[PDB]
Design a protein around this ligand. Structure first.
Ligand SMILES: O=C(O)CC(F)(F)C(=O)N1N[C@@H](c2c(-c3ccc(Cl)cc3)c3ccccc3[nH]c2=O)C[C@H]1c1ccc(Cl)cc1
Ligand SMILES: *[C@@H]1O[C@H](CO)[C@@H](O[C@@H]2O[C@H](CO)[C@@H](O)[C@H](O)[C@H]2NC(C)=O)[C@H](O)[C@H]1NC(C)=O
Ligand SMILES: *[C@@H]1O[C@H](CO)[C@@H](O)[C@H](O)[C@H]1NC(C)=O
Ligand SMILES: *[C@@H]1O[C@H](CO)[C@@H](O)[C@H](O)[C@H]1NC(C)=O
Ligand SMILES: *[C@@H]1O[C@H](CO)[C@@H](O)[C@H](O)[C@H]1NC(C)=O
Ligand SMILES: N[C@@H](CCC(=O)O)C(=O)O
Ligand SMILES: N[C@@H](CCC(=O)O)C(=O)O
Lengths: 351, 372, 72, 371, 131
């Protein structure tokens, strides 16, 4: 037998000094009350059949009442695991937010009046028509002035436009150089389909979830996957989509699967956050010699090194349709904007 | 290489026309573990042979090069058939008496240093990893490849909706086929378009359309730029400490060369016997066939000296080495204890480094700079 | 990245008779959602809440060019 | 470890990579030490038959050992013995960092649109010939379409005549967008031009007659200079003018511009490169050692500890302890991984050449009718 | 990412070629006003300007004349593209077991809270005594 807890036990015996014999428990799992009798890893320590119970035990309130736990050394709560969902957006492509947009509209609005003013010195329609033409690659019939000063002012419009277009390529190139929603399941069958979620219902996870949310527990009895891997395979096959278990095991299982197809809900959701520990005899008097020894390994470099050796898995967390359909929202205001202009012109002469 | 039909084994010239130096190399042929072995004269040449000839002239001694019976290096190889242990391979032959000097790639470590001397290294190197190179094809894309092909009919339909109602509003308030030339032409940015709009509703609509023109082509320019930037499988085993090596997953197989120095290195370590306990069954008789196995996709990684693997990777452009060096120890001429040649041999190697002689050997036997 | 993982705690003398009481109360309020209620209320959200400027001179330069062109 | 200094004694303390190795050995050899700094000379230079420096005390029975920065070479092996090297060292050069339209892509592309020049010209005339400009004027528009320019040119009519040119129109924009996207990739694939290739380069071997001379130098009284003075004696004579006094003072002279090369040890220049501001200095060849000779501990002649000390060092390599020492002490910060006149001058080389192509065509009019 | 001297050669290029283009057609079997009207715009890619090349020698002028822009306008798009690739190491955000933490020479001069526990943690860690 070898692993994480065993490594701590071997290290503990060095500093303290004792002889230990492992006593793998035949009875099922960690602990449970059957109205008078305790079984599992905690049943054989209350009934004076052992002196310590090392393993993946979790601190609770009933257990801490009758036994004395040590200082927690691994975090653990309640978590849910789901599969992996099937864009990189830019609303209007936002070159520098609606700041430069105000500048170009205001600049082009003022110049039209200025250019029209200088034509009297030498055109309400021709000046405005040519001005928005050249800045947008022309391609429209626009009057070309025969003067000298007029042609110079119009000329400097193009070079500003193209470099804007070149810069309009930079921001799009910028975004690619730099280079997820779980609003569902938030309902006890109140969602439209029959939602399925299940546990391994013998441990503290059921006891904690049995007191609160009584309605969920009664419905949850339909799904009683009596394993971890058996529940895992059924989850991938689509039979189940939510698995609730320890947050120090579900996270590990979702941190070594191929393809990064299993990500827990949220970004490491934990609910109770009751850490692990070592059960004792309630009168063992070994509680003090363990606490100081354990608090040392949490200090500088001991515990913070073991987890790299055992729990260090890989495959962690990490143009579409709406990207180009962002200016489409401005297409919905195209015909509407032009429609009211005709109505405004109609009422100019009629009224 | 096998000899010719006569006693000699052919002659050839190098890149500069100098004659390559060869020495008769007697040893077993057709190894085939499990078949009788016969001794047939062959000839050997290369790095160590050229260095050996230099020492023979300098210190005035004669030689007769012969190969090894079993193609394995030294290893303690403790067995129950003997009292404690007995040396095997090249190392055992030196102590037996059949060998006086050892000239071959041979790492310097603690175990072999308790019985034999080592002189000074020729070159310094370390261990590394050899893996199969990724797909040579760049997956270069053609026209209509980026962006959804189906929605490009929508872009084709985008001009369709603009074309139909452009002249439809030119009849009621004030031909239908006479308007699409301007509408289609402007997105071509050509001179075909000639109809300047007169109605204010169409005049505004014409200009706001223009803003739609340049965005796609610039985006398509970026999308093409996307095709030449984003390429990263991120499949790089980083050092020995990578968690993939620690877990003995069956999707990849690790292997090495039997009875080499790396086998001693892993066995001695009191922690590493957790992965190679499963990779011990996956080994090889020599390093000349593990490369073929990797090339045939029957393996995933290989551990060997960087002196050989780097040369192989350069020669054949189907493999790329990765990882970082983690055990550095040079080679060296090996001889038995109390041998009187030790003092002279060590000085010649040191004097050869300063003379630049090793630079000539490197550039005619190691560096080929092919398919870089 | 975090490098010293250890929680808080209420400190008291060794012979304090209230130690066993207090540990149970914390472990009983840690699971019935009380800690989440305090988390959201207090600590959780607490939201924080040249060339272009020279266009005036360019118009003057254009006006100066206009004046020169008108004169010439 | 306490580090006594002679000349009266003033107490000092010594620490670092070499000291850490020394105390590890003393825990497996069962011996002690009385370290003291060397006063007269440093690193040894055999002058007039007598030695000096660090190696000058072991020879004359004053220290019996010496650990530090010592480079193994033949001239010291005869007088004193050396243990197994525990680090690599050669000789390199340190330099600063430097400050073609067809260079992106290659000549493969430019042999294609040449076909389109003839093909598009023939297509327009062939279509126009049937229904019934051409060479005189129609060639202007179809080549002009390749470039999105607002030049005022005629627009040929025809219900179907201009249909294909519209199809021909969007070939250019997708071409130019492709023709500019690949350009940015070459800036991603930009290489380092470098200046020299090694000690054997002509620039190093040329003292004069090679423009303003190359300014290279070193510090004397070490192995890195005696090695040079035995193979390239003509080169060592020239470099004597650009002599320095220490690594630090010479290093700052590189940035100012008085020097542009530095030939020194190949294991301490790496530390300088990895611990400088903005990593503006890079070794030639990305750490290219030339005369590979490692370090070591010098012991007195005919010493019994030699058989034991080297064995212990080789045990460290197997135990994997040396990795922690080098990671702690020998790790840097930066790692080796702006349009200019020279790059786009080559662009104008063809444009200037293409300018002259207009002059020769003028003389063709002379023989158009006369000949 | 621009240089005034480099901007000068392109800036003065149009003036040199504008006068050369106009006077070239005199010997053929172009007014100065037009040479400063339809030549500045085309290099700048502007609709301001009138006329087309007329002489055979004038016809061959446009090849290199037109060929100027697209070979250089993309260069700026490439030239600008260089800088967005550059992000600067200002976001070094180096921490935990880094040489920056153990660089005790007037660079970061970072401090902690007196007493506390982080002071005890550093004091206990004998490997970081200098810090
Ligand atoms: O009652 C309601 O109106 C529903 C709702 F609001 F309860 C609700 O949907 N959810 N409540 C969440 C929550 C729990 C808790 C955990 C598991 C289950 Cl089964 C029930 C509740 C929790 C449990 C113990 C201690 C602290 C906790 N803190 C919390 O936020 C979690 C959340 C939830 C998320 C995923 C699934 Cl698949 C189902 C529910
Ligand atoms: C190592 O080299 C030295 C120097 O050449 C050898 O010493 C010579 O040995 C020969 C015969 O043994 C004598 O005739 C010379 O007089 C010696 N020269 C000197 C300077 O002592 C030495 O023999 C070599 N080592 C071995 C093992 O042969
Ligand atoms: C859960 O606990 C009960 C208690 O008796 C046991 O009978 C049952 O087998 C346990 N469940 C599993 C899957 O072992
Ligand atoms: C709380 O403390 C009191 C006095 O210290 C003790 O009598 C009692 O048993 C404790 N527990 C409860 C639940 O009251
Ligand atoms: C090198 O040795 C010479 C001769 O002893 C001496 O003059 C010179 O000062 C030494 N160099 C340095 C840097 O001390
Ligand atoms: N690790 C936990 C998981 C189940 C539970 O919450 O009780 C235990 O076995 O105690
Ligand atoms: N350890 C070498 C280094 C020489 C040098 O740094 O210049 C020596 O003393 O010869």
């Amino acid at each position: 037998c070898k692993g994480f807890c065993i490594d701590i036990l071997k290290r503990l015996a060095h500093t303290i000094g004792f002889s230990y014999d492992l006593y793998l428990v035949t009875n099922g799992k960690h602990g449970k009350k059957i109205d008078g009798v305790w079984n599992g890893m905690i049943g054989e320590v209350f009934y004076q059949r052992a002196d310590m119970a090392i393993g993946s035990l979790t601190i609770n309130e009933e257990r801490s009442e009758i036994v004395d736990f040590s200082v927690p050394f691994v975090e653990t709560g309640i978590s849910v695991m789901v599969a992996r969902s099937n864009v990189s957006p830019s609303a209007f492509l936002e070159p520098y937010s609606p700041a430069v947009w105000v500048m170009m509209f205001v600049m082009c609005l003022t110049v039209v009046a200025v250019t029209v003013f200088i034509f009297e010195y030498l055109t309400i329609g021709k000046s405005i028509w040519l001005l928005w033409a050249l800045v947008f690659n022309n391609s429209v019939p626009v009057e070309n002035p025969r003067g000298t000063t007029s042609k110079i002012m119009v000329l400097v419009w193009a070079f500003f436009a193209v470099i804007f277009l070149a810069s309009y390529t930079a921001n799009l190139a910028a975004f690619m150089i730099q280079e997820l929603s779980d609003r569902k399941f938030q309902r006890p069958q109140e969602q439209y389909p029959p939602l399925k979620f299940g546990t391994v219902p013998n441990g503290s996870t059921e006891k904690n979830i049995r007191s609160n949310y009584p309605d969920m527990h009664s419905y949850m009895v339909r799904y009683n996957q009596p394993r971890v891997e058996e529940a895992l395979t059924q989850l991938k096959a689509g039979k189940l989509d939510a698995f609730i278990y320890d947050a120090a095991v579900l996270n590990y299982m979702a941190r070594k699967d191929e393809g990064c197809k299993l990500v827990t809900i949220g970004s490491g959701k934990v609910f109770a956050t009751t850490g692990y520990g070592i059960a004792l005899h309630k009168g063992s008097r070994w509680k003090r010699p363990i606490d100081l020894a354990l608090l040392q390994f949490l200090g500088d470099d001991e515990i913070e090194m073991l987890e790299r050796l055992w729990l260090s898995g890989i495959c962690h967390n990490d143009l579409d349709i709406d990207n180009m359909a962002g200016v489409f929202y401005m297409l919905l205001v195209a015909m509407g904007l032009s429609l009211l202009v005709f109505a405004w012109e109609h009422l100019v002469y009629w009224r | 290489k096998p000899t010719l039909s006569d006693g000699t084994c052919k002659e050839e010239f190098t890149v500069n026309g100098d004659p390559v130096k060869k020495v008769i190399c007697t040893g077993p042929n057709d190894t085939s573990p499990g078949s009788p072995r016969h001794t047939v004269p062959q000839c050997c040449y290369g790095f160590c042979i050229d260095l050996l000839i230099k020492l023979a002239r300098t210190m005035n001694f004669t030689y007769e090069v012969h190969l090894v019976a079993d193609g394995k290096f030294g290893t303690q190889e403790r067995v129950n058939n003997s009292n404690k242990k007995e040396w095997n391979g090249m190392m055992g032959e030196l102590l037996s008496g059949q060998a006086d000097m050892i000239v071959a790639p041979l790492t310097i470590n603690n175990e072999r240093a308790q019985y034999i001397e080592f002189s000074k290294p020729f070159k310094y190197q370390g261990l590394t990893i050899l893996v199969k190179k990724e797909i040579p094809r760049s997956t270069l894309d053609s026209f209509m490849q980026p962006f959804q092909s189906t929605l490009w009919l929508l872009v084709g339909l985008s001009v369709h909706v603009v074309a139909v109602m452009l002249y439809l509003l030119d009849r009621f308030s004030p031909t239908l086929s006479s308007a699409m030339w301007f509408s289609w032409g402007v997105l071509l940015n050509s001179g075909i378009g000639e109809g300047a709009p007169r109605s204010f509703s169409a005049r505004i609509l014409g200009m706001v359309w223009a803003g739609f023109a340049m965005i796609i082509v610039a985006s398509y320019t970026a999308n093409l730029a996307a095709f030449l930037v984003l390429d990263r499988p991120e499949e790089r085993i980083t050092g020995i400490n990578d968690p993939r090596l620690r877990n003995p997953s069956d999707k990849f197989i690790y292997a090495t060369v039997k009875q080499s120095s790396v086998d001693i290195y892993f066995r001695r370590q009191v922690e590493l016997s957790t992965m190679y306990r499963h990779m011990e069954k996956h080994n090889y008789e020599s390093a000349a066939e593990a490369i073929q196995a990797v090339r045939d996709n029957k393996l995933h990684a290989f551990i060997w000296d960087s002196a050989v693997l780097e040369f192989e990777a350069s020669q054949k452009c189907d493999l790329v080495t990765t990882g970082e060096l983690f055990f550095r120890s040079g080679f060296g001429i090996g001889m038995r204890k109390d041998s009187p040649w030790k003092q002279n041999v060590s000085l010649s190697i040191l004097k050869s480094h300063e003379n630049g002689f090793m630079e000539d050997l490197d550039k005619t036997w190691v560096r080929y700079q092919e398919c870089d | 990245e975090l490098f010293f993982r250890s929680g808080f705690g209420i400190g008291m003398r060794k012979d304090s008779p209230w130690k066993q009481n207090v540990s149970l109360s914390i472990l009983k309020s840690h699971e019935n959602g009380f800690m989440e209620d305090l988390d959201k209320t207090w600590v959780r959200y607490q939201e924080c809440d040249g060339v272009f400027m020279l266009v005036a001179g360019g118009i003057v330069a254009g006006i100066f060019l206009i004046f020169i062109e008108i004169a010439y | 470890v306490p580090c006594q200094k002679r000349i009266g004694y003033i107490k000092k303390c010594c620490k670092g990579f070499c000291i850490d190795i020394l105390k590890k050995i003393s825990k497996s050899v069962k011996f002690t030490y009385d370290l003291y700094l060397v006063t007269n000379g440093k690193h040894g230079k055999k002058i007039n038959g007598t030695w000096n420096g660090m190696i000058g005390e072991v020879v004359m029975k004053r220290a019996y050992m010496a650990v530090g920065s010592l480079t193994i070479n033949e001239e010291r092996s005869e007088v004193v013995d050396f243990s197994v090297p525990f680090i690599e060292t050669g000789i390199s050069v340190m330099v600063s960092r430097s400050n073609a339209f067809l260079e992106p892509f290659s000549a493969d592309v430019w042999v294609m649109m040449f076909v389109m020049l003839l093909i598009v010209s023939a297509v327009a005339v062939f279509v126009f010939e049937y229904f019934s400009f051409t060479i005189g004027k129609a060639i202007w528009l179809l080549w002009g379409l390749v470039f999105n320019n607002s030049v005022p040119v005629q627009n040929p009519k025809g219900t179907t005549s201009k249909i294909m040119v519209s199809v021909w129109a969007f070939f250019a924009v997708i071409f130019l967008a492709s023709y500019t996207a690949n350009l940015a990739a070459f800036m991603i694939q930009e290489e380092y031009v470098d200046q020299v290739s090694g000690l054997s380069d002509k620039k190093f071997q040329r003292p004069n007659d090679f423009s303003p001379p190359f300014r290279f130098g070193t510090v004397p009284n070490g192995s890195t200079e005696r090695n040079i003075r035995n193979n390239y004696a003509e080169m060592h004579a020239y470099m004597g003018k650009f002599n320095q006094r220490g690594v630090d003072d010479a290093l700052l002279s590189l940035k100012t511009g008085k020097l542009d090369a530095f030939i020194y040890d190949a294991a301490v220049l790496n530390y300088m490169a990895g611990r400088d501001e903005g990593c503006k200095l890079v070794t030639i060849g990305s750490g290219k050692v030339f005369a590979s000779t490692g370090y070591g501990i010098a012991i007195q002649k005919d010493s019994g500890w030699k058989r034991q000390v080297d064995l212990a060092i080789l045990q460290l390599f197997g135990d994997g302890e040396m990795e922690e020492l080098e990671a702690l002490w020998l790790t840097g910060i930066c790692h080796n991984e702006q349009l200019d006149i020279d790059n786009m001058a080559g662009v104008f080389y063809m444009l200037g050449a293409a300018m002259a192509l207009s002059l020769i065509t003028f003389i063709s009019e002379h023989l158009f009718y006369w000949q | 990412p621009f240089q005034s001297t480099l901007w000068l050669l392109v800036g003065l290029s149009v003036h040199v070629v504008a006068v050369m283009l106009y006077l070239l057609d005199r010997f053929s079997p172009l007014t100065l006003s037009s040479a400063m009207w339809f030549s500045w715009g085309v290099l700048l890619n502007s609709g301001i300007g009138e006329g087309a090349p007329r002489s055979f020698s004038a016809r061959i002028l446009g090849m290199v004349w037109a060929g100027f822009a697209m070979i250089i306008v993309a260069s700026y798009t490439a030239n600008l593209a260089a800088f967005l690739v550059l992000d600067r190491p200002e976001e070094r955000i180096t921490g935990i077991n880094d040489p920056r933490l153990r660089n005790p020479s007037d660079k970061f001069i970072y401090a902690t809270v007196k007493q506390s526990s982080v002071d005890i943690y550093f004091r206990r860690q004998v490997e970081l005594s200098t810090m």
